[PDB]
Every structure is written in C-alpha cells, then in structure tokens.
Design a protein around this nucleic acid. Structure first.
Ligand SMILES: [Mg+2]
Ligand SMILES: [Zn+2]
Ligand SMILES: [Zn+2]
Ligand SMILES: [Zn+2]
Lengths: 519, 93, 168, 229, 171, 84, 61, 58, 88
RNA sequence: UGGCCGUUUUCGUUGU
C-alpha cells in the first residue's frame, strides 16, 4: 500500500539463477561509460557528466530527481554504468578455478586433454553434479603432462607438452617442458592469453567441464568490463553536516579509473616493457583490493588514514555482513525496551505497559460500522491523551498528522480508512528477552495500561524467560495488522506454552514467595 | 530483531507475522524486473507509464516485486561483483 | 497485463533469426509455434479461421450474448452496441463492417459447404480458404507459399469456390 | 507421529512381574471356579461358569497378551524398565470415568465380556495415523501404534475392567470414545518446524552444564572428532 | 487472418464483493476490460467465446492484502496482421502523403514512393480520388494492396500498405 | 493432475492449529474490511471474535489447498474439516 | 496565532498557581508545560493566567 | 559460513535456486512454506452459493 | 531550521542560567555562512530530547585558538522511583 | 501554506 500506483503485475520470486555476466551483457545494461576520475566538475556544483558522480546513475539527494527513471529518492532504484579496461584483468575470486580450468584443457588447441575414448572420463561425464563432475575431470586430467595432437586420427590438438601451472600469489606461472631434457622456459599466463584460449572452448567441453553456455561461460571469469554501481551503493559520509567525505569505495573506483587511464597512455609513448608490466600489476592490484582487501599472503590496501579499505567481500562477510547484519536480522519498528519488575496481582498472560509507550506506539485500524463511534472518540482524544490516535489515513494512502492538524473535529471518518489508535488494554503484543535460547523465551501477552515506566511480569513467568528483577531488561514488538494479531493470539499466547516440548513437562511453576508460603 | 528471535518465531510457526516484521516494519521497497533476462534493469517511468529493458529491448514482459531494500542492495553489490542473480517468477523443473 | 499459454521461455545462448513475423516465409513467431498448448494441456494445434468462418463465429457468439442479456427472447451495427465501451463499440462495429465487406461467404449453407469441401499445414489451408483468386495463374502469382508441393489440386478448388460464389 | 508435549511417563504392567504374577493377574478360567471372576461383580455369573464360547474369546485375548509381553520384554526393553513416555494417559481416564458414574461399592457389572473384547479389538484398529488404502500405509499404521496398543491392552483387560474398575456399559463406551479423541488430538500437526524445536531443546541444556564428560565431550561429538581425547 | 485464441486474464476483486455471484461479476468485468485492446503479442482483441460460460475455477486470497484473484481462463477470437499478407483493403480518405486505407480496425499507411506512376490525384472531381487505365480507388471500392511493414507500439499497431507490386490495386 | 479427487483424499480431516490461525486471520481481515458476515453479531464487535464465532458454527466459505511434498495438492472445505 | 511561547499560570484546577509555558497551541485546548514538575499538561484556554504588560491578564491577551 | 565463497561457486556453476527452503523467502521477505504458510487459501464459490439471494456483490 | 523552539536563547544566541529546559529545545544557536541573500544554515545544539531540568551555569571563554568556546551545565535531581537499582 | 534535513569509524568502559 505504501508504494504508488504501478501498472506492472505483482507476483513473487520463484527461481534465482546464478551465473556470471557476459561482457556484452554488461554493455547492454550499463547506461553510461565512466571516463573521468574527477567526480566534481569544477567545484561549481553539477559533478562532471560521465564521471563517478554522473546524474544519470541515480539521484542521491532530495532535490534532484534521477534523470533516467525520472523519479526521486522515493522510487528510483539507481542505475548502472560500465567501465572499459584497456587491458583485461583477472578476477581475484576465481584464481584457483581459473588455474584448474587451464589445467584441464590444452594450451594452444585449447580443448580437453582427453576424449570420450577413455571410459573413466565418459563415466565422469555421467556425473550430474557439475561441481563433482568438474572435480573428477580435474582429477583425471591433472596427470596428462602432454596434450595430444593426435588420438591416444588427429583430434585437432596442439601436441605440445602442457605446462605445470603453479600459483604465484596474485599471478600464474606455467612451467613448460619443451621437447631427454630441455631448458624449461616458464612465463606469465597473461590474462589476454587465457581469455583468447577460453574464447574458442567448445560447448561440448564447456558442459563437460561443469560450466553452462547460457550463463557460465568460462572466459567471463576474466575481468574485461567492470560495471560501476550508482552512488546508492556507495553514499558519502557528511562528517560534520556541511563537511562531506568520500566513500572509500568511490575512492577505489576512482583509483582504478586512474590506473586504467595511465595504462592507456603507455603504448603511445616510451613503454620499455618493465614499466608496462609494473603498471599492469598495479592496475590488477587496485581492481583486486577493490573486490577483496584480505587476500592472503600479501599486504592490504589503506586510505590516507592508514586503515584497511572496505572491499565488498568485507561488506558481505562477518557478523555485520549484509546477511547476518541486515537480512537474517534487522532493526525493526514499533518496538520498545525497558526494565521489568514483579507483579503478584497481574494475570499470567498480562504485562505492565507504561502509559508513555502505549501513547507512542500505535496500530492501524480499518473503519467499520462497529467502531465508528469509538474511533471518532480516539480521534478527538488527541495524540497526547491516552487513549488516543496519531494519524488518519485516507483511501488513497495520505497520512493526516494529528499533531499539526487544528481541524480535528472537522474530520469525518470513512469506511476503509485507518486510524493509528493508541495501544489499549487486552491487545496482543510480542515479548522477548536476550538471549532467546529456547522458544519459551518469546511469547504473546496481553496489554494492560499502567503508570510508571517499567514492564511488569507475573512472578511465575520468570523461569521461561530465565529472568530476574536484579536489573534485567526486556524488549517488545507490536503487530501492525489483523492477520498478524490473529496469528499471535492463536499461536504464541502464554497458556499454550505451559508444557515444554523439550521435556514434555510444565515449564513455569510456583516459585519463591508463593511456593515457600503455600508450603 | 536478531537471529535467535527469528529462530524462536520460526519455531512458534508464525509465518505471516515474521514476514511483515521483516517487510513492513523495515525497509519495504518495490522494484521492477524484465521477464526475459529476469533482472531488475527495466527502465521504467511510472507517471510516464512507460517500460523497457535496454538489453532485452523488452516493453511488455515486465513485473514488479516487493522486496526488502537490503535485499536489492545485496543484489546490486553482487552484480558489481560480476555475479548476476536473475529473478524468475515461474519454476522450470 | 495479458498472458498466454507458453511458459519459461528464458534467454538462451542461441538466438533465432526465425522470429521476425513473415507469412510468406512461414515465420509466425515463438508464440504461434507449430505445437501450442491449451489451458488443460491437451492436444491443441493452432486454429486458423477464414474470414467467413470467423464472421459466423463472432456473429453467433454476439447473438448468444444478446440472448443471454435479454434472457428469453442481428443487425451489424446493432450487434456492435452489445459490447461496453466507446472504443470497444467502435472497434467491434468496424471489424463487423470489415467482415461484411470482405467475408467471401455469407450464409450458413454456403459456409458449411466450403468447410466440408476444404476439410499438410493448418495455416496454409486456412489462408487458402481466406485467399480467393480467379484461376491457378493468380493463385501462383499471389501465393508464394505453394509454388512447389507436388500436389496442387487448386484448379478444381477454385472452380468449386467460385461455384459457391454468391452472385452480386 | 506425536507431538512432544502430548506424552507422559506411564507404566505398562505387562512387562514387569513374575510369570506367576502375570498368570494370577491376567489369566482367566471359566471351567474352574476357584480361579474365575467373582460372581458378586456380574449380573450373569451363572451364564459364564464352565462355558466355552466365552472361554475361546478369553483364550484368544490372553494369547495376544502373552505374545505382546514376550515381544516387548525380549525386543523393546531388554533391561526391564517399564516406565516410558507414551501418549494419552490412561489411569486418569479410568478414574475420571469412575468419578463420573460413582463406580465405588460392589455393584455387579452389567457388561458382557464379548462386548468388552469386541470394543478393545475394534479400538486397536481405529487409531488413525496415516489415512489411505495402500497396503504399505496400513503396515505403517500397524507399526506406529504398536507400543501404544500394547499399553492399551495391558490396561483394558477383562479381569482388570470387571474387578479393579467395575465399569458399566456406558462407562466403558465413554472410556473408549475418550481414548479415541484424546489420541486423535495428540498428533503432531503438519508444518511444525520440528527441526528448529529439536535444535533448541538439545542446545539449551548444555547451557546449564576418569572419562571426559561435559561440554567438551558434546563439542567432540557434534564436530565428529576423529581422535577423541 | 482472423484467429481463435485461448486467452486468460487474471482479475482482482475486493473482499467487499464476496457473495453468491462473483462468477458472473468477473465475467462482465472481463467482457468490459479485455475487449477492444491492441497488443504486440496478440493484437486487437474484438470478441471472446462463450462469455456466459467461462470457468473461473477456485480463486486465490492474496496473503496480507485480503484481495482475491481469479485466473479467468477462456478462449477468444483476435486478429493481427503479419508481414507478407495480401488482402483486400478499404479506402476512406485521400491524403498527399498516402491514401488512408482503413483496412479493418487499424489504419494502413501508404508510402508516397510506393504508388503506381499512372495513378494520379484529381482534386477537381467529386469524390476526390485517383483514376487510371482500368483502375480507380474511391470510398467503398475493393482494392488489393500488400502490407510489408508492421510497426507495433504496444497500443495501436502501425501498418504500411503498398501497391507497387504485381496485381496490387483496384480490381 | 496436481489436484486429487475428493474420493481419494488422504490428508487428515481435523483442522490443524496453523489452518485455524490462518483462516481466522484471513476471515477477520475480510470481515474487518467490509466482507459479509455469515452468522449473527450481538455484542462481539471485534472482527476476530466474529470470525471465531463463525468458525464455531462452521459457516466460513474458505477452501484449504494443502500442497503435497511432490507438488500435488488437494482441496478441503472449511465446512467439512472436523474442528476440535 | 500570536499567543504562543509566553509564560502562563493556572488560576483554577488541581495545579492552582503554577508557572507554565505554552509549548503547543493546536486549538481550544492549550498544551502548557510547567516548571516545578518535569511534565506538560493540557488545559482549557479559560483556566490560565497570561502575563501582560502589567500584572497577570486572563485569557484576553 | 563462507558467504562469499558460496556465492562465487553459485555464480561459477550457473546454479539455480528454487526458493524451496525457509531462509530464502526470509531474505526475500515472502511467506515461507512453514507453519501458517505451509499451505494456501482457496476462496470457494460453491459454498457461497449458500448465501441469501440478496447478497449479490455490486 | 530545527523543529524545536529558540525563544529561550538570549538576543546573542546563548541561554541564560536559571531557565528551565525541556526535550527538543534549542540551547545554543550557531550559524554557518553558506558558500554562495538567505545564505545561512542552522547549526544549533539542541538539548538531548530525553532530558529535562534547569540551566545552571553558562561559561563563555576563548579556546586555545581564540574562538568562542561555550559550556552549559544543565542540572536536575533524580527522585528514586519504580525501576531504580540499589545494592548493599 | 503546506512540505520539512543531523556522520562515520574506531577504541573504550560498563550492563543482563
Ligand atoms: Mg541477574
Ligand atoms: Zn532513476
Ligand atoms: Zn594443443
Ligand atoms: Zn531484460
């Protein structure tokens, strides 16, 4: 209901298809090319077009509406831009896989070292698990020291001995044994070399290698075009309001652009080999640390402050990664926290709720004939009076703020409108403690409005929360919809929790004063 | 609304509540996708009532899905990592 | 907004030049493939309807709808009022006019006769029924999709069709 | 196929005790009167003494119990522990029936043995767990309720009913209906994310706790250490 | 080439409209909504078959919104022009850039470069039209033209008619 | 195909707690947003209470569609389900 | 409304004679904040005393 | 664990995820096939035929 | 501008001691010149919205670098009530 | 005359 009208039909996600990006795909999707390291045109507002801060990428501020979609911050999901590398570069996260794929195929003919003739391999092809299939294929083909130009009848091969590829950290060296012994002249398996080698690989070997011609085409594992995410993904931090500091990701993107531009301007001047190699390694280093700053064995990249950079791998890993940070769990709305205290005189399924909270939180309520009067009363109570409401909602989704509305009486409720009435007694709300070891650490209680600013629990229910009033705290949550209210009532009410499926026995019990007394 | 809270909510088998607690009381967001490539790239202008997928040249096979903003953020961070999750609204097999 | 019966149809590695519509090259597109599927999935190959058969089907459906609305008790433009909407009313009126002016066959007897006579590709036969001519000469001059089939039998077909031709 | 909350430590008396005690408890003999039902507890003591068509039903049921005792005692519980969690407590249902109909005193039972055994045998085939007519379905149904049916028979034996409980006809009907419904409600429902529940139930107790015993041992087990300490 | 097509459209109903006869209500909603639209996948929608006996089946309840959706599956009759069609045409107006040949629901565009040389326009005569040797294109007369262009704009397809090939024109 | 005929339905006929909760919430929502009420209201102005009462009378027009693990489904009526 | 952000007292009510400040003046029920307690109370416009050029003026300023 | 490595493998193998598990829709904010979401709700038109004749929706 | 109130400041922008303060009230109004009329932006220092009391002692001196450098010591008394903590 | 904007990252101390 929050979103405006949209013509596209609404459905749900059923399938997620993983697979790399074909560079032509990136070009087909990108809406701009990024060429200018200078983000700000001349410090005269209007950042340089075609720069990292291009207005085509996506609106970053309230005032400016995204040029491409034509909407504002509310709706625009940002947009993408591509970035060409003069020199194709590796992907730091595929070094072992790329190495293995190279081991599995020839150098020059660039085909599988073995045919279906060997029954071991034809058997391996029968593996449906692409990962295990590739594992076995590598297992067989890692001992084929020489690529056959002829059938083990020409197979179209090269016949040269396949080099032994050993991982030199960030680079790859192949030590050939040229045709008793010859001088072994290894060389750097340069990215373009591998890309061209992969470019002609057959769909036959592709599928037999576990890859997929439609989505996972092996050569794309080498970085050629690097898409640039709009600012949405790399917003800047206003250190002190007017003072604005640049996101480290934006800095890394700019530095990659600089290294790329420099790599462009070597071939048009004196390029004594050594300089080109060093600059190439530097560009690869930028693009790598840009995508993982924790590459084992080598020093990390820093800012001018010396602190290690924030590569996306960090953004996703660790406790605070996107998953464990904001997807598995997240900070939520309509909550409240406080201390807890005893209350021998409350029911089992009830809980002291300080008045201020019930005044703060609120719950939408559709307009029917059965509550029109009561809702009008809550309206006229004003938001600062319990019971009271906080907003009035139209059929179109507008919110009337009762704070800045002096015409409270002149509002006429309408069927289907919603009124965020205050919390009232007997309503259902969740309840919780941390840690939430066993499912008897969460329950759905009923509301009772009271003075003072603490929650109160019946002294019996402490055991399931494993709580005590020596200073402990609790959290709260509130349903914002009726179906949710129904579910809470029917599934998480305290009474249903009395016996613990852990040990098929009652979990609560008469404790402390009640017990020692009734004795 | 930490992990363990999610797990307790699952154990109590309350689905819709968990859904909305992670949807409407949090980063509720809408997007559009192309039914061919399956991606979110469809350039749309709502008030202008137009739609198209640049790569797919696609003007009619477009849908809209409601997802947590953090999820879309994760997808974009991914497809900047050369990894492209394509979203399909129908199963294949 | 609207949907069809084909599912999946994802982006594949291999594209197709056989996607631009062309009636002479027998290029109908992906959604009009040789073997389509119905709502229930049964064997349902494509239906191609002649101008007169389409006119008769639309007319009978429209009169049935008029009867259902009346609930217990024909003119081309009068039949156009049944549908709701000025644009819908106009489009139904104009398609009825086009059927009237170019439906080679009018009455139930003659349409049934041509259906029994004509009734290998479904579309080619449907278009042959839709396409009229004078002799085999005009048929070959205007229809580049039957040049070489080793079974023409088109002269007698044209003679029969012109025999059913309502005099005007 | 049972929820974990709908079970209770019960005792199946068929397991423990001596052969002598078993015989003296469950066995019946219509021909011999010195070891037969007391006549002051039944309205038809005359119709029974020395009869056979009843003796055959009693023999069939007693053989069923003998087989059950052998099976349980030799397969399920080797050591002899007869206390276990089982669904739908019985003693409580028995005494609720007693109270509901004022079943004290020595008033003679007006309930025919054939009706009792007919109901018991019918009941054992009514405890639905899986509903369907495939053979395998029926075999699974049989396998599931094996120990529960053993308990039911261990309790509702004709001697037991007529002497220790002295139910009447309607009391017995209510007992059977009660057991049926109570068991039918005691099923694990569809959709229970039982995995999560088991995970939590196993994890929590660890919080409160010459061989190596304690959390280190549990960690070893969970990670499957090749070389235990 | 008219076609019979198996058309299905998903419809949305508010829970306030939950009574004995949602079937019929969905039916006239479909009749009112689907009919008269032109689309690239299918084309102009004109008529639907057995409007009074559509099997709407068992509907869905959207979770969390309370709306109910029905997958109205039905068979209709629609038309769309494809490239390489030779069919008779109707002319209703004459313009210098090409006579307006309203062939059925749509308008057919006539290129100025694709008109026979001997065919010329005479403003003086009433009705304004073209006359030539054994040829005349006037309002209401049968004319043969070939369509070699089909530009669809998802709302109203654009058709290009030609009379610059063998045996194209007024019979 | 994915449906299974009512003669051969095999799933349990009792209404599971989850089904109870989902139907109650769905109906109470619908009730609370101008849906018709299939039973009488006397004092229980709460839509959830109306739904509870209506279920107690077995007067709720909703069909459960249970999905089998394979993908097939069967259709039970809220009317026929034995509510405990 | 020119009658905001002014020192105001209570002439009648349970807080007879307490100095308060007008924090919010939506309409016809003035929200006034006191000094002695740490709280704000609503109160009708006619139950207050408004400071003026001289002396304390009731609701006519 | 190994979120980045798992994601890279998924991309490499062109893997396809069915959203069958629970956590999937949890990230995608959809009703996971659990508990209350372990089935569907079919609106019946047959039983609503039992309604009084004057309750026809407008 | 903020949503709070400013009237408690002096004519020069500081609040005088002895004035009661409430939540969401501005106590120090600072202005920043806007890089290019209407070329100033609020840089206030509102009171913590969860606090109340009376301003007690305003200080106004130069910093090490010779700019104005203020300090406001707001006070209040805490009454024990429900939810406190105590210990032997 | 609506409409309406307050940092991050570290480290620390504590709390249950
Ligand atoms: Mg403690
Ligand atoms: Zn945009
Ligand atoms: Zn080779
Ligand atoms: Zn696309």
């Amino acid at each position: 209901s929050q979103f405006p009208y949209s013509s596209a039909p609404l459905r749900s996600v059923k399938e997620v298809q993983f697979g790399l990006l074909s560079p032509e795909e990136i070009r087909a999707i990108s809406v701009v090319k990024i060429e200018y390291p200078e983000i700000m045109d001349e410090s005269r507002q209007r950042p340089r077009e075609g720069g990292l801060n291009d207005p085509k990428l996506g609106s970053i501020d309230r005032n400016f509406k995204c040029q491409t979609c034509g909407e504002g911050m509310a709706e625009c999901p940002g947009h993408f831009g591509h970035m060409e590398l003069a020199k194709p570069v590796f992907h730091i996260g595929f070094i072992p896989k790329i190495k293995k794929v190279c081991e599995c195929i020839c150098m020059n003919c660039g085909k599988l070292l073995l045919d279906e003739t060997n029954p071991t391999m034809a058997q391996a092809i029968r593996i449906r698990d692409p990962k295990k299939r590739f594992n076995a294929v590598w297992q067989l083909c890692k001992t084929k020291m020489v690529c056959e130009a002829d059938a083990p009848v020409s197979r179209g091969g090269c016949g040269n001995t396949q080099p032994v590829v050993r991982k030199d950290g960030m680079k790859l060296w192949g030590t050939w044994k040229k045709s008793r012994d010859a001088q072994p002249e290894r060389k750097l398996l340069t990215p373009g070399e591998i890309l061209n080698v992969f470019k002609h690989i057959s769909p036959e070997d592709c599928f037999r290698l576990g890859f997929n011609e439609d989505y996972a085409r092996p050569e794309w594992m080498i970085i050629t075009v690097l898409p640039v995410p709009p600012p949405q993904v790399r917003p800047s931090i206003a250190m002190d309001e007017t003072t604005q500091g640049q996101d480290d990701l934006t800095h890394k993107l700019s530095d990659i652009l600089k290294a790329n531009i420099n790599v462009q301007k070597l071939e048009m001047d004196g390029s004594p080999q050594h300089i080109i190699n060093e600059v190439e390694q530097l560009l690869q280093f930028h693009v790598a640390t840009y995508m993982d700053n924790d590459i084992a064995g080598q020093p990390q990249a820093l800012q001018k402050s010396g602190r290690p950079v924030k590569a996306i791998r960090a953004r996703l890993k660790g406790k605070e990664g996107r998953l464990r940070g904001n997807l598995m769990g997240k900070r939520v709305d309509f909550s409240a926290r406080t201390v807890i205290s005893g209350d021998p005189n409350l029911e089992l399924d009830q809980v002291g709720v300080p008045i201020s909270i019930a005044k703060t939180l609120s719950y939408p309520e559709t307009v029917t004939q059965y509550n029109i009067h009561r809702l009008t009363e809550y309206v006229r109570n004003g938001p600062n009076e319990h019971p009271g409401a906080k907003y009035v909602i139209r059929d179109n989704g507008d919110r009337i703020d009762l704070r800045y509305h002096k015409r409270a009486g002149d509002i006429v409720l309408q069927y289907g409108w919603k009124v965020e009435r205050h919390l009232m007694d007997d309503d259902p709300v969740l309840f919780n403690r941390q840690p939430s070891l066993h499912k008897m650490s969460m329950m759905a209680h009923r509301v009772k409005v009271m003075p003072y600013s603490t929650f109160r629990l019946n002294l019996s229910v402490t055991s399931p929360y494993n709580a005590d009033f020596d200073g402990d705290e609790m959290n709260l949550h509130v349903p914002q919809s009726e179906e949710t209210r129904a579910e809470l009532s029917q599934l998480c009410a305290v009474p249903l929790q009395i016996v613990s499926p852990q040990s098929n026995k009652p979990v609560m019990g008469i404790v402390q004063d009640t017990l020692c007394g009734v004795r | 609304f930490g992990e363990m809270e999610r797990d307790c909510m699952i154990a109590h088998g309350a689905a819709g509540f968990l859904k909305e607690r992670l949807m409407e009381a949090s980063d509720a967001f809408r997007v559009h996708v192309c039914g061919i490539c399956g991606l979110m790239s469809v350039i749309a202008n709502l008030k202008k009532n137009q739609f198209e997928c640049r790569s797919c040249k696609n003007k009619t096979n477009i849908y809209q899905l409601h997802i947590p903003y953090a999820a879309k953020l994760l997808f974009q961070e991914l497809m900047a990592m050369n990894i492209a999750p394509r979203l399909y609204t129908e199963r294949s097999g | 907004v609207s949907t069809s019966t084909v599912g999946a149809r994802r982006r594949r590695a291999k594209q197709q030049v056989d996607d631009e519509e062309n009636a002479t090259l027998l290029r109908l597109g992906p959604e009009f493939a040789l073997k389509q599927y119905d709502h229930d999935g049964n064997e349902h190959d494509l239906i191609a309807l002649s101008l007169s058969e389409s006119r008769l089907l639309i007319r009978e459906a429209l009169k049935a709808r008029s009867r259902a609305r009346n609930g217990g008790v024909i003119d081309d433009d009068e039949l156009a009022k049944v549908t709701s909407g000025a644009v819908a009313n106009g489009v139904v009126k104009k398609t009825l006019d086009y059927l009237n002016t170019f439906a080679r066959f009018k009455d139930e007897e003659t349409c049934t006769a041509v259906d029994q006579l004509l009734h290998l590709h479904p579309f080619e036969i449907a278009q042959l029924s839709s396409l009229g001519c004078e002799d085999v000469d005009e048929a070959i001059t205007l229809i580049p999709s039957l040049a070489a089939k080793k079974e023409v039998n088109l002269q007698r077909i044209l003679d029969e069709l012109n025999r059913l031709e309502d005099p005007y | 196929g049972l929820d974990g909350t709908q079970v209770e430590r019960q005792t199946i008396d068929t397991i423990p005790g001596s052969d002598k005690a078993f015989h003296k408890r469950y066995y019946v003999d219509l021909m011999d009167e010195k070891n037969s039902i007391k006549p002051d507890v039944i309205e038809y003591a005359a119709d029974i003494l020395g009869d056979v068509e009843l003796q055959k039903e009693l023999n069939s049921e007693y053989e069923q119990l003998v087989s059950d005792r052998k099976f349980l005692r030799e397969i399920v519980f080797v050591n002899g522990d007869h206390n276990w969690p089982l669904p739908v407590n019985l003693r409580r249902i028995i005494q609720n029936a007693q109270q509901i109909f004022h079943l004290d005193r020595a008033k003679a039972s007006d309930l025919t043995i054939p009706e009792i055994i007919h109901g018991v045998r019918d009941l054992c085939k009514k405890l639905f767990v899986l509903r369907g007519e495939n053979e395998l379905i029926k075999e699974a149904q049989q396998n599931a309720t094996s120990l529960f049916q053993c308990l039911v028979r261990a309790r509702l034996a004709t001697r037991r009913i007529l002497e220790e409980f002295r139910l009447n006809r309607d009391a017995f009907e209510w007992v059977l209906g009660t057991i049926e419904a109570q068991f039918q409600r005691s099923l694990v429902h569809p959709g229970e994310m039982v995995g999560v529940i088991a995970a939590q139930s196993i994890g929590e107790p660890a919080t409160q706790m010459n061989v190596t015993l304690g959390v280190p041992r549990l960690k070893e087990i969970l990670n499957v250490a090749k070389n235990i300490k | 080439m008219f076609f019979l097509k198996d058309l299905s459209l998903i419809l949305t109903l508010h829970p306030s409209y939950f009574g004995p006869q949602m079937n019929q209500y969905l039916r006239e909603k479909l009749l009112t909504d689907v009919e008269g639209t032109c689309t690239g996948q299918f084309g102009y929608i004109v008529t639907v078959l057995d409007g009074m006996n559509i099997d709407v089946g068992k509907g869905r309840i959207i979770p969390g919104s309370g709306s109910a959706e029905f997958e109205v599956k039905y068979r209709a009759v629609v038309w769309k022009p494809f490239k390489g069609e030779v069919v008779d045409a109707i002319v209703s107006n004459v313009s210098p850039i090409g006579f307006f040949a309203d062939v059925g629901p749509l308008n057919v565009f006539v290129s100025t470069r694709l008109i026979p040389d001997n065919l010329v326009y005479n403003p003086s005569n009433s009705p304004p039209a073209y006359m030539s040797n054994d040829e005349l294109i006037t309002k209401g007369s049968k004319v043969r033209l070939k369509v070699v262009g089909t530009r669809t704009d998802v709302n109203e397809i654009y058709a290009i008619g030609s009379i610059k090939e063998d045996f194209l024109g007024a019979i | 195909e994915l449906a299974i005929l009512k003669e051969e339905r095999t799933t349990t006929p009792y209404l599971t707690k989850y089904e109870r909760a989902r139907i109650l919430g769905t109906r109470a929502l619908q009730i609370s947003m101008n849906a018709p009420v299939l039973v009488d209201i006397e004092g229980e102005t709460d839509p959830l209470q109306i739904a509870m009462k209506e279920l107690s009378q077995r007067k709720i027009p909703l069909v459960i569609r249970r999905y089998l693990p394979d993908g097939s489904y069967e259709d039970w009526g809220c009317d026929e389900l034995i509510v405990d | 409304d020119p009658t905001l952000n002014k020192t105001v007292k209570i002439r009648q009510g349970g807080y007879k004679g307490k100095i308060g400040i007008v924090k919010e003046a939506n309409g016809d029920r003035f929200r006034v904040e006191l000094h002695n307690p740490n709280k704000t109370i609503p109160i009708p416009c006619s139950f207050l005393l408004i400071e003026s050029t001289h002396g304390w003026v009731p609701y006519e300023d | 664990e190994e979120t980045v490595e798992i994601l890279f493998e998924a991309g490499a193998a062109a893997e396809l995820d069915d959203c069958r598990g629970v956590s999937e829709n949890v990230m995608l904010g959809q009703l996971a096939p659990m508990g209350t979401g372990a089935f569907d709700v079919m609106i019946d038109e047959k039983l609503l035929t039992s309604l009084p004749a004057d309750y026809a929706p407008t | 501008l903020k949503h709070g109130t400013y009237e408690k400041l002096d004519e020069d922008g500081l609040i005088a001691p002895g004035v009661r303060v409430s939540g969401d009230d501005i106590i120090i109004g600072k202005t920043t010149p806007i890089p290019p009329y209407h070329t100033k932006r609020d840089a206030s220092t509102p009171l913590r919205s969860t606090e109340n009391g009376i301003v007690d002692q305003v200080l106004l001196t130069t910093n090490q670098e010779g700019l104005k450098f203020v300090k406001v010591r707001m006070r209040t008394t805490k009454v024990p009530q429900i939810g406190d903590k105590f210990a032997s």
